[PDB]
Amino acid sequence: RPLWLPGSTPPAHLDGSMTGDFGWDPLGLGANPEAMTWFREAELQNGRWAMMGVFGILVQELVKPDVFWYDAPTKIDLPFNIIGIVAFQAFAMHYVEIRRWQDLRKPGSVNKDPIFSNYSLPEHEPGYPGGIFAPFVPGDIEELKLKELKNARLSMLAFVGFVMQAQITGKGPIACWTDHLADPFGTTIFSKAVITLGGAVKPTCQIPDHVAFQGIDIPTPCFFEGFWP
Amino acid sequence: RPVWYPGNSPPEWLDGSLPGDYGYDPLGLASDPEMLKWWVQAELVHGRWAMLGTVGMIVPGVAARAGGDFPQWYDAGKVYIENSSIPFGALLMTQVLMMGWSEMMRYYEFVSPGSQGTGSFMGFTEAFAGTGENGYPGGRFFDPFGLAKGDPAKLQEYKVKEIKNGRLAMFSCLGYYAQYAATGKGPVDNWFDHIADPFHNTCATNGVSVPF
Amino acid sequence: MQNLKIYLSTAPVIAFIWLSLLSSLIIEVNRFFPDPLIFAF
Amino acid sequence: RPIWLPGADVPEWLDGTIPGDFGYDPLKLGKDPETLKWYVQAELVHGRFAMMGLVGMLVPELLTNAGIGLPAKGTEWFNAGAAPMFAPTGVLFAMQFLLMGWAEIRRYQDFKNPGSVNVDPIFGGKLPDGNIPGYPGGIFDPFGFAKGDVDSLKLKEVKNGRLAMFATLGFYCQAVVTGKGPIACWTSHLADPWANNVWSIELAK
Amino acid sequence: RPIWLPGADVPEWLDGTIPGDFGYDPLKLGKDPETLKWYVQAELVHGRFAMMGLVGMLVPELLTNAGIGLPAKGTEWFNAGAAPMFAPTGVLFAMQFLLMGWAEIRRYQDFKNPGSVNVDPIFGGKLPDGNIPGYPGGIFDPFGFAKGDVDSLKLKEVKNGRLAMFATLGFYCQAVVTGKGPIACWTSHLADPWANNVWSIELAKVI
Ligand SMILES: CC(/C=C/C=C(C)/C=C/[C@@]12O[C@]1(C)C[C@@H](O)CC2(C)C)=C\C=C\C=C(C)\C=C\C=C(C)\C=C\[C@@]12O[C@]1(C)C[C@@H](O)CC2(C)C
Ligand SMILES: CC(/C=C/C=C(C)/C=C/[C@@]12O[C@]1(C)C[C@@H](O)CC2(C)C)=C\C=C\C=C(C)\C=C\C=C(C)\C=C\[C@@]12O[C@]1(C)C[C@@H](O)CC2(C)C
Ligand SMILES: CC(/C=C/C=C(C)/C=C/[C@@]12O[C@]1(C)C[C@@H](O)CC2(C)C)=C\C=C\C=C(C)\C=C\C=C(C)\C=C\[C@@]12O[C@]1(C)C[C@@H](O)CC2(C)C
Numbered sequence A: 001r002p003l004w005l006p007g008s009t010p011p012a013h014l015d016g017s018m019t020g021d022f023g024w025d026p027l028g029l030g031a032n033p034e035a036m037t038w039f040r041e042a043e044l045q046n047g048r049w050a051m052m053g054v055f056g057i058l059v060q061e062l063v064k065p066d067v068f069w070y071d072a073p074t075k076i077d078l079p080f081n082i083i084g085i086v087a088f089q090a091f092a093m094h095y096v097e098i099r100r101w102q103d104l105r106k107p108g109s110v111n112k113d114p115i116f117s118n119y120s121l122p123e124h125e126p127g128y129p130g131g132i133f134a135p136f137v138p139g140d141i142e143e144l145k146l147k148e149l150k151n152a153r154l155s156m157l158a159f160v161g162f163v164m165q166a167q168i169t170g171k172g173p174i175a176c177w178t179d180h181l182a183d184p185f186g187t188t189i190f191s192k193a194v195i196t197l198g199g200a201v202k203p204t205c206q207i208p209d210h211v212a213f214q215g216i217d218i219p220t221p222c223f224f225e226g227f228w229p
Numbered sequence B: 001r002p003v004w005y006p007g008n009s010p011p012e013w014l015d016g017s018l019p020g021d022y023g024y025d026p027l028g029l030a031s032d033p034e035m036l037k038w039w040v041q042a043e044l045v046h047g048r049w050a051m052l053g054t055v056g057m058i059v060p061g062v063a064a065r066a067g068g069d070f071p072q073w074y075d076a077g078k079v080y081i082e083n084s085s086i087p088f089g090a091l092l093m094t095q096v097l098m099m100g101w102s103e104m105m106r107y108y109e110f111v112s113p114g115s116q117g118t119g120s121f122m123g124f125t126e127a128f129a130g131t132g133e134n135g136y137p138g139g140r141f142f143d144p145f146g147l148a149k150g151d152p153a154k155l156q157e158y159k160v161k162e163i164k165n166g167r168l169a170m171f172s173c174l175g176y177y178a179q180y181a182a183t184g185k186g187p188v189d190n191w192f193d194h195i196a197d198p199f200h201n202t203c204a205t206n207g208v209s210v211p212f
Numbered sequence C: 001m002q003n004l005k006i007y008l009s010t011a012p013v014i015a016f017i018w019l020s021l022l023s024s025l026i027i028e029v030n031r032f033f034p035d036p037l038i039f040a041f
Numbered sequence D: 001r002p003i004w005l006p007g008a009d010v011p012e013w014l015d016g017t018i019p020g021d022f023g024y025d026p027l028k029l030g031k032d033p034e035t036l037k038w039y040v041q042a043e044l045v046h047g048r049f050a051m052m053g054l055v056g057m058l059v060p061e062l063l064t065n066a067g068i069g070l071p072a073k074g075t076e077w078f079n080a081g082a083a084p085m086f087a088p089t090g091v092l093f094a095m096q097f098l099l100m101g102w103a104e105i106r107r108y109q110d111f112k113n114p115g116s117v118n119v120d121p122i123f124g125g126k127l128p129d130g131n132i133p134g135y136p137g138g139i140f141d142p143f144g145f146a147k148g149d150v151d152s153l154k155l156k157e158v159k160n161g162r163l164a165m166f167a168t169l170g171f172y173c174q175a176v177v178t179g180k181g182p183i184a185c186w187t188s189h190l191a192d193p194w195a196n197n198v199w200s201i202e203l204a205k
Numbered sequence E: 001r002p003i004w005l006p007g008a009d010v011p012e013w014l015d016g017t018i019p020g021d022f023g024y025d026p027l028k029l030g031k032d033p034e035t036l037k038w039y040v041q042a043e044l045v046h047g048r049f050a051m052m053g054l055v056g057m058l059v060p061e062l063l064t065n066a067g068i069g070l071p072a073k074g075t076e077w078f079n080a081g082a083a084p085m086f087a088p089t090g091v092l093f094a095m096q097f098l099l100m101g102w103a104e105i106r107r108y109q110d111f112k113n114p115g116s117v118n119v120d121p122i123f124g125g126k127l128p129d130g131n132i133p134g135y136p137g138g139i140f141d142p143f144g145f146a147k148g149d150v151d152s153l154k155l156k157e158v159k160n161g162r163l164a165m166f167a168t169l170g171f172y173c174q175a176v177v178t179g180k181g182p183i184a185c186w187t188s189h190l191a192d193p194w195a196n197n198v199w200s201i202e203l204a205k206v207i
């Protein structure tokens, strides 16, 4: 089967089973059937938030107004306080999730609509709630299911780019996009740092600490600068 | 088996299966079968405190190259209680309280492996029950990633790595002490000092190790 | 290690080791709490 | 049956019989039936007396302010504590104790041996065949309820009281945290619900 | 069965028979039976005094220091040594001794001969008894407990007695050091937990 490394020899416990299994386990965390099932949800969860997140920042910049994203201040301003939202954020996501988390651990018991009964679906796959969540079904096959991971697993991997780039380069995702294509051999953060024997240069973080928001510290330091190239 | 000091044979009592067993007991302190399992835990514990100690020394040192104002591992004790805000007694006596709990708990699972997770410590059965080996608790808390649950052939292969990385962390952490008492400077400072002018920064030039 | 213990368990050994634990202790009690005539403290 | 946390571990001893058991006992409390039974009436009695109580301290807010109808004052159900009234505390408290103690011993002496006694007073006798320890049929329920909806009904009572109980604890947290009253806080929040919260107004820094 | 520490012993001579038994007797005082019988009563008499007594220390000082309402005369529990008024400490003491020792020898000579402290003719009047061994019952249980919760009730007496004894010793040693009252020792710690701890003052501070 296709693998992450075309000449590789996939680990024993992982063969051709889960959606999109290319045989990648340096550490072999999937050998445990119980925990791998847990991890199986996380990959979707981390993926499905990042995808919707990475598409957020990009749209947040190019079509939208341009402030690379550290912003509390917006042009949707701050309509209802903050502690107003965070109040409603907790109770919202609390119900939303400890609900879905229970369909992971003890499957099917949640399918009923709490108020009245339209239910949902049969028990299906713990991390793929059918029915009301997936009405449209653009592709008709689990080919589309393998098609979902390979997008997300890139986006999660892509998101980390936005952090680090916006650390030292101090610019949004698509700003440095165009900045690279102009004089490409510059701005690789390969050029921009060396650390050979003797000499060590590192670019300094272009975002500062102590960002002022409504009279609050918010230290927000850089991510482990000392070990940067 | 690849023993240390090749050409000899291991001490006849330990040829057995222990992770990282090279047949080194030149003073024969494993000769007591009851006592060996006590040393096997003793090493495992030191190996685990070593590997945390080494990183705890190097990183604040390596952090100091870029600035970021930390102390060296020595005289990091002062700098904290220099700035204090809580007394020394309260801190050291919270140590003995919380820390002594774990150790004196870690002990009675070694004595009798059945208890400690029978129950009736806030529930938590099977998290503390232990996986049956000397220095390996396993479980929910001590093993959050559920590793050492799946393939055992891969597990026994970690248990070897853990020791061999531990024996090196100890033997390095003996260097941090000794090369502090001589050169009086941080571990990464020395790792730069010898990488800069290797010739005049060597051991014979510290003026302590090689007295005249 | 079997037989090294049994020797360390002989009478004169413990007689030495255990008195040297009192002796040392009773010596150092007088280091921190010197000159104790009566129990007054 | 419906539970509080759908798809839960459903304790043994809680198999639904009693009026309103949803299978909620997270502390594995009340395994043995006798202490369970004792608690069953606690929630019953202790729930009823909250309903009337919560309604009790809620009244002074609606009358005194909203309509200001024939003011009784009763500020934040606090000055009701220290108020002129008529009799001294000494007269007044020790008078409720002796009055209530009669009814309390009666109530208890039913449940002590449940199927027996109480019932007939002096002044002849009542004898409405009082059977349920938790609920007594007779003078206590005059309009002649227990009309055949009990299961369908008891639950409605048990479930109201719990929320009257829970809302009560609100007041004691409503009060000591803020210092205003039930409608004082219910109105204050609805002024600017986003800037009026416990997180907002219990943050005094 | 709960153990004092889960991994040790439950000494041979001690099984889990009596309540409040977690298997802790390191110095092995109780070994022979006719002794363990004795100490069990010595515990409860302590456990009972300690519970009542501690509330004599705790609550009065608490009232005063919890507000103006009913300030406790005699101030802290060790400031009530003063404030005798009516009778001299010479007499009031030997009135106690004579008065108590009547009741408590009655308690011992019962443990000696279990059935009846006093059979109906002797010690005119009185002598209701209704006495099981180890617990008086009778008069001393007016509301008529031992309704079938006994075993649990027994566990709840000891386990609270065990703690009030141990907690009482704190009142001694604390006051002997910090010279304050318990809620003073209480709140000052709860105020700032670190600097106000033990072992920052006078005792482990010897270091
Ligand atoms: C990269 C990543 C994970 C990478 C993990 C890898 C390679 C792991 C590999 C291994 O495990 C395997 C495979 C197998 C093992 O044998 C080996 C190891 C090595 C253990 C997760 C990121 C996951 C990233 C996540 C979950 C991010 C979520 C949140 C987002 C996107 C929210 C963003 C926003 O809130 C902001 C930031 C600001 C707002 O203005 C806008 C919005 C943008 C939308
Ligand atoms: C555990 C350990 C190190 C732990 C380090 C820690 C906790 C870190 C502490 C710090 O971070 C803090 C607390 C504060 C920081 O600011 C500073 C420091 C102080 C640094 C080292 C062990 C170090 C232990 C070492 C080096 C042991 C070497 C032993 C050898 C070689 C023994 C060999 C033999 O025993 C055998 C194998 C067989 C026999 O037959 C023959 C002989 C020879 C007897
Ligand atoms: C009765 C009551 C209040 C009654 C109040 C009255 C009469 C008030 C009267 C007054 O106001 C007026 C009228 C006028 C005022 O001027 C004066 C006073 C006198 C002050 C509150 C009870 C309030 C009762 C409350 C809040 C109880 C909450 C308990 C919970 C949530 C327990 C849950 C669990 O027990 C289960 C369910 C299962 C276990 O496994 C797990 C746990 C968690 C242990």
Ligand SMILES: CC(/C=C/C=C(C)/C=C/[C@@]12O[C@]1(C)C[C@@H](O)CC2(C)C)=C\C=C\C=C(C)\C=C\C=C(C)\C=C\[C@@]12O[C@]1(C)C[C@@H](O)CC2(C)C
Residues within 6 Å of the ligand: E024, E025, E026, E027, E028, E029, E046, E047, E049, E050, E052, E053, E054, E056, E057, E077, E078, E080, E081, E165, E166, E168, E169
């Ligand atoms: C009874 C008691 C205290 C009673 C206090 C009273 C009445 C207080 C009275 C007062 O406050 C008032 C009322 C009012 C104030 O105005 C006057 C005073 C007078 C100040 C303490 C017991 C205190 C008893 C204590 C602390 C016992 C601790 C025992 C421990 C820890 C273990 C013991 C062992 O026996 C085992 C379990 C197993 C063996 O193998 C090992 C060992 C060690 C032998």
